[PDB]
Amino acid sequence: YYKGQTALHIAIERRNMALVTLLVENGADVQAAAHGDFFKKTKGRPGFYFGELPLSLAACTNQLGIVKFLLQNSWQ
Amino acid sequence: YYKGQTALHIAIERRNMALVTLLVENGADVQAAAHGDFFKKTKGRPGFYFGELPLSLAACTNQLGIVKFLLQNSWQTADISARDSVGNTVLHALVEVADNTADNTKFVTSMYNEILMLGAKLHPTLKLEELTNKKGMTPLALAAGTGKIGVLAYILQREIQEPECRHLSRKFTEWAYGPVHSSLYDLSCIDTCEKNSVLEVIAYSSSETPNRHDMLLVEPLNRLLQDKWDRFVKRIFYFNFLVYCLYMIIFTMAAYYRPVDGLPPFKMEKTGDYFRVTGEILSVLGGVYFFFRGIQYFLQRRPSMKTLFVDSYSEMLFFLQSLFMLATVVLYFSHLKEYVASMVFSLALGWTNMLYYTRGFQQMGIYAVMIEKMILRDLCRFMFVYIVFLFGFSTAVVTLIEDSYNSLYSTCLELFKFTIGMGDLEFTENYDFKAVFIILLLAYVILTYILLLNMLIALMGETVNKIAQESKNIWKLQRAITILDTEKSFLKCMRKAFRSGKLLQVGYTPDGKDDYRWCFRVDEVNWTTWN
Numbered sequence: 001y002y003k004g005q006t007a008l009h010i011a012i013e014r015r016n017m018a019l020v021t022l023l024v025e026n027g028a029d030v031q032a033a034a035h036g037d038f039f040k041k042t043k044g045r046p047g048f049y050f051g052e053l054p055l056s057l058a059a060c061t062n063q064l065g066i067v068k069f070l071l072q073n074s075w076q
Numbered sequence: 077y078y079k080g081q082t083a084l085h086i087a088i089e090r091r092n093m094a095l096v097t098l099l100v101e102n103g104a105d106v107q108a109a110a111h112g113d114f115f116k117k118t119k120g121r122p123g124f125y126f127g128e129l130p131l132s133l134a135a136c137t138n139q140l141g142i143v144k145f146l147l148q149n150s151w152q153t154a155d156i157s158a159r160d161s162v163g164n165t166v167l168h169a170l171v172e173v174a175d176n177t178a179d180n181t182k183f184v185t186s187m188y189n190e191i192l193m194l195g196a197k198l199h200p201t202l203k204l205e206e207l208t209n210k211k212g213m214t215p216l217a218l219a220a221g222t223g224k225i226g227v228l229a230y231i232l233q234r235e236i237q238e239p240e241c242r243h244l245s246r247k248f249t250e251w252a253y254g255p256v257h258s259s260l261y262d263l264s265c266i267d268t269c270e271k272n273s274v275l276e277v278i279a280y281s282s283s284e285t286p287n288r289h290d291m292l293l294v295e296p297l298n299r300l301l302q303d304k305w306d307r308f309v310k311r312i313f314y315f316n317f318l319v320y321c322l323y324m325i326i327f328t329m330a331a332y333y334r335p336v337d338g339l340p341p342f343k344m345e346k347t348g349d350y351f352r353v354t355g356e357i358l359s360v361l362g363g364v365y366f367f368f369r370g371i372q373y374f375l376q377r378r379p380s381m382k383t384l385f386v387d388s389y390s391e392m393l394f395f396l397q398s399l400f401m402l403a404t405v406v407l408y409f410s411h412l413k414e415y416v417a418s419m420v421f422s423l424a425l426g427w428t429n430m431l432y433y434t435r436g437f438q439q440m441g442i443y444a445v446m447i448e449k450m451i452l453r454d455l456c457r458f459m460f461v462y463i464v465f466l467f468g469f470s471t472a473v474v475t476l477i478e479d480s481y482n483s484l485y486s487t488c489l490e491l492f493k494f495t496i497g498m499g500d501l502e503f504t505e506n507y508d509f510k511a512v513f514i515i516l517l518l519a520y521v522i523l524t525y526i527l528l529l530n531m532l533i534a535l536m537g538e539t540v541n542k543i544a545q546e547s548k549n550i551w552k553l554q555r556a557i558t559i560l561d562t563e564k565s566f567l568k569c570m571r572k573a574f575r576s577g578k579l580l581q582v583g584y585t586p587d588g589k590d591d592y593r594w595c596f597r598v599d600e601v602n603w604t605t606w607n
């Protein structure tokens with residue numbers, strides 16, 4: 001249902017870049033596939049598809065500040 | 077006239093809180109009933125009803141500052157659940173003053189909100205919106221029963237964000253994920269109120285009540301009915317549609333294959349007679365059903381003599397269809413051949429009453445709504461004027477005839493043919509003055525065929541541009557009545573399978589118990605409520 005979710009995905013959706021930088025630096029992977037039922041195409045079901053990837057969420061969630069941070073962050 | 081008034085009532089209306097506090101502290105009662113003629117329902121008379129209580133006046137008069145003062149004033153505080161002779165509390169009375177203007181609607185909702193929290197802060201345990209007046213109506217039912225679209229649209233969508241005052245809120249958000257958020261409406265006393273559900277008050281109401289057809293567009297009502305439709309009513313309606321089509325197929329054949337040799341009641345001789353009388357039995361049974369099913373309607377929906385054609389045009393025809401069936405049985409055992417006359421009007425009504433079942437289908441049901449409007453609006457105006465002309469020029473014509481069309485029927489019958497494209501300008505030579513006969517028919521033709529029929533086309537087009545939305549909303553109300561008449565009749569014992577929504581714990585009783593509420597989920601998206 002939430003199969004594949006991470007606490008990094010939480011922070012992007014809860015308007016929390018202070019903790020996205022916290023999780024990535026401690027080694028939170030930024031390739032994680034939220035390949036869970038809630039995260040697929042809605043097709044009537046109460047869901048939100050964004051791309052099954054952390055960067056994809058931030059782009060579909062309107063924090064361009066976060067988005068750029070994911071790509072020049074030094075840890076990964 | 078002013079019977080029951082106090083100088084405290086004066087001060088609230090004369091914009092004087094400095095003296096309201098003056099009068100209460102000296103002991104001016106704040107329960108006083110202005111039970112005087114000027115203070116009752118207007119009903120044409122030059123009055124102002126506010127609730128027959130001081131607190132009620134301040135709420136209907138827009139001094140929230142005064143209103144709060146009445147309830148924490150130390151000398152004496154108004155009883156929040158205090159009602160009037162009508163039984164209307166402040167919230168009841170605060171509905172009856174609504175008039176569905178934005179400046180009024182913005183206020184009444186702004187005020188209605190605030191007495192609730194205040195009553196919750198004073199009394200977290202008392203339930204205000206559940207209180208019922210003398211008649212048996214709540215502030216919610218009163219808003220729907222009286223046409224109050226903005227109040228109703230407020231009460232249903234009531235999301236409050238406060239620590240102690242969410243148990244009053246009705247539109248709950250259960251979860252949220254980015255732009256997606258999934259709301260929850262309550263359904264308490266909306267679908268299954270023991271007394272006067274909102275649906276059963278919008279739909280079993282009178283067209284005098286404004287905005288019947290707009291109230292069901294308030295969320296969650298629209299989504300709620302389409303949920304009953306998709307779940308269980310659509311199948312039953314299509315089934316009801318099938319049985320009626322089999323009924324009319326059967327009443328059609330039993331009519332077509334009627335005996336022609338003898339007088340009724342006829343004899344079972346061959347086998348086809350047995351298999352026909354069956355259809356004749358089954359024909360009558362439907363008439364009895366539609367008879368009782370119509371008596372039922374016209375009792376529990378005591379019809380306003382004008383409202384018959386507007387709200388109940390189809391019910392009138394099914395009932396009328398029934399009457400011709402019953403007259404067809406009275407006359408079949410009374411040996412009279414005139415059963416056929418009755419019987420053929422039943423068929424013609426019977427098949428036209430298929431258009432009833434268009435209301436399970438949007439674009440067909442809207443079309444049948446437009447049909448019944450054109451009949452009552454455009455065609456009745458037309459046919460009136462048409463018959464004045466028809467009868468005017470016929471009499472003229474038949475007065476000129478000498479001799480055979482020397483009859484007002486045949487002349488009226490010949491002049492009606494012009495309007496169905498079958499007019500002979502030479503249907504008589506039997507007269508003395510051809511100039512008169514021709515000038516007069518041409519005047520008839522020009523006035524009726526060239527002008528008035530084509531004017532009707534033009535009138536209809538004006539109507540279609542107007543009733544287009546009205547007819548969509550009358551359609552949804554027709555379907556609503558089907559959903560309600562269905563879920564009553566079908567279950568009528570168990571009333572457990574149509575339960576729209578589910579037990580969803582939304583919060584807590586302000587004492588601390590759990591807040592379980594039958595609630596209707598709605599999924600929604602935003603792209604500007606980014607927080």
Ligand SMILES: CCCCCCCC/C=C/CCCCCCCC(=O)O[C@@H](COC(=O)CCCCCCCCCCCCCCC)COP(=O)([O-])OCC[N+](C)(C)C
Pocket residue numbers: 322325326329330332333334335347348349351352354355356
């Ligand atoms: C279709 C869907 C609806 C339901 C099914 C109905 C099935 C339809 C059939 C049903 C029965 C057919 C009879 C067969 C045997 C006799 C044949 C015969 O002589 O026929 C003749 C008359 O026939 C009749 O008059 C028959 C009566 C038909 C009424 C319709 C059925 C009523 C429903 C209850 C029946 C059971 C159904 C109950 C279950 C639903 C044929 O006409 P003819 O020879 O020219 O006669 C003179 C004609 N004239 C009078 C016009 C001048």
Ligand SMILES: CCCCCCCC/C=C/CCCCCCCC(=O)O[C@@H](COC(=O)CCCCCCCCCCCCCCC)COP(=O)([O-])OCC[N+](C)(C)C
Pocket residue numbers: 314317318321430431433434436437438439440441
């Ligand atoms: C069943 C018994 C009779 C046979 C059926 C005959 C009627 C047809 C079946 C009717 C019931 C079952 C159909 C369900 C499937 C969809 C149909 C369809 O194409 O809808 C489409 C067209 O709209 C129509 O086809 C509706 C037209 C018929 C309405 C009844 C009017 C009078 C019937 C007199 C008949 C003579 C009876 C005498 C001889 C039998 C779409 O409809 P819509 O306008 O966009 O509305 C929204 C659609 N929705 C609600 C599905 C979301």
Ligand SMILES: CCCCCCCC/C=C\CCCCCCCC(=O)O[C@@H](COC(=O)CCCCCCCCCCCCCCC)COP(=O)([O-])OCC[N+](C)(C)C
Pocket residue numbers: 325329
């Ligand atoms: C785009 C919109 C669509 C519009 C067009 C759609 C199509 C429509 C248009 C055209 C197609 C129609 C085809 C029919 C042709 C006429 C009939 C004929 O020729 O003879 C037949 C007439 O006799 C009977 O039918 C028997 C009488 C008893 C039964 C009557 C009920 C009929 C069946 C149930 C009806 C219920 C409905 C169906 C079920 C629910 C057979 O007679 P025969 O063999 O020559 O001789 C037998 C003796 N007799 C004649 C003395 C009796």
Ligand SMILES: CCCCCCCC/C=C\CCCCCCCC(=O)O[C@@H](COC(=O)CCCCCCCCCCCCCCC)COP(=O)([O-])OCC[N+](C)(C)C
Pocket residue numbers: 315316317319320322323324326357358361362363365366369370390391394395432
């Ligand atoms: C072998 C013998 C049987 C042969 C086949 C029998 C089948 C014959 C076929 C057709 C006629 C069927 C009986 C008469 C009904 C008339 C149609 C009607 O009212 O439909 C209703 C459908 O809703 C219903 O509830 C219909 C009844 C359901 C039962 C199915 C038919 C069998 C009952 C009969 C017993 C059979 C035993 C013998 C009886 C002598 C109409 O819907 P409504 O919601 O009321 O809305 C319209 C009116 N309103 C808007 C004003 C409200």
Ligand SMILES: CCCCCCCC/C=C\CCCCCCCC(=O)O[C@@H](COC(=O)CCCCCCCCCCCCCCC)COP(=O)([O-])OCC[N+](C)(C)C
Pocket residue numbers: 382385386452453454456457459460461463
């Ligand atoms: C006999 C000689 C008379 C001529 C022939 C009689 C045959 C019948 C013909 C015409 C007769 C005159 C009627 C026309 C009245 C105007 C239409 C009207 O107000 O419709 C209203 C609805 O409709 C209804 O509320 C009911 C309509 C049916 C009842 C009238 C006809 C039959 C009864 C009467 C007695 C006669 C019956 C037979 C004998 C007893 C509203 O329509 P509108 O206002 O246009 O809508 C625009 C809305 N707007 C206002 C918001 C903009």
Ligand SMILES: CCCCCCCC/C=C\CCCCCCCC(=O)O[C@@H](COC(=O)CCCCCCCCCCCCCCC)COP(=O)([O-])OCC[N+](C)(C)C
Pocket residue numbers: 460463464465466467482483484485488
């Ligand atoms: C919808 C159609 C048009 C109107 C119908 C309603 C009108 C009713 C019509 C006729 C009268 C009612 C019947 C009474 C008894 C029989 C008398 C009779 O028919 O006529 C008598 C004459 O009479 C006339 O020539 C004048 C009668 C009409 C004027 C009355 C006002 C009608 C008002 C409403 C009008 C609509 C107002 C406009 C709309 C607001 C006798 O004529 P006869 O018997 O034919 O004589 C044949 C002689 N032969 C045996 C040698 C062959």
Ligand SMILES: CCCCCCCC/C=C\CCCCCCCC(=O)O[C@@H](COC(=O)CCCCCCCCCCCCCCC)COP(=O)([O-])OCC[N+](C)(C)C
Pocket residue numbers: 508509510511512515
């Ligand atoms: C909107 C309000 C309008 C008011 C309505 C008032 C209605 C008044 C209208 C008309 C009344 C006047 C004419 C008829 C007089 C009575 C009969 C008569 O004397 O006939 C004479 C014949 O006469 C002819 O043969 C010549 C025809 C002349 C008239 C034609 C134009 C008038 C209509 C213009 C239309 C535009 C109207 C205005 C709009 C632009 C003599 O009798 P006869 O025996 O017939 O003679 C032999 C002839 N035959 C062998 C052929 C038989």
Ligand SMILES: CCCCCCCC/C=C\CCCCCCCC(=O)O[C@@H](COC(=O)CCCCCCCCCCCCCCC)COP(=O)([O-])OCC[N+](C)(C)C
Pocket residue numbers: 510511512514515516518519522523
């Ligand atoms: C808004 C209020 C409503 C309207 C109220 C007024 C409406 C009044 C309408 C029309 C009145 C005018 C038409 C004539 C009427 C009959 C008079 C007559 O006696 O004619 C004679 C024709 O005599 C001729 O000389 C022929 C010329 C007329 C052409 C026919 C009209 C065509 C129909 C459309 C005209 C539309 C014009 C109307 C425009 C308004 C007929 O007798 P006859 O014995 O056949 O005579 C000659 C025969 N011969 C040649 C074989 C020898």
Ligand SMILES: C[C@@H]1CC[C@@]2(OC1)O[C@H]1C[C@H]3[C@@H]4CC=C5C[C@@H](OCCC(CO)CO)CC[C@]5(C)[C@H]4CC[C@]3(C)[C@H]1[C@@H]2C
Pocket residue numbers: 399400403412414417418
């Ligand atoms: C609700 C609907 C309103 C319209 C309507 O359906 C119901 O109302 C019905 C009443 C019927 C009449 C009743 C009585 C008679 C008397 C009879 O006289 C010979 C009697 C003979 C044996 O007694 C000699 O004594 C002639 C026929 C007539 C006038 C009927 C005609 C059809 C009528 C008008 C029917 C019509 C279709």
Ligand SMILES: COc1cccc(NC(=O)/C=C/c2ccc(Cl)cc2)c1
Pocket residue numbers: 390393421424425428429431432444445447448451
């Ligand atoms: C929702 O049902 C609808 C909607 C619109 C129109 C109608 N039917 C009529 O007006 C039928 C009229 C009529 C008149 C005379 C005779 Cl003899 C038979 C029938 C039904």
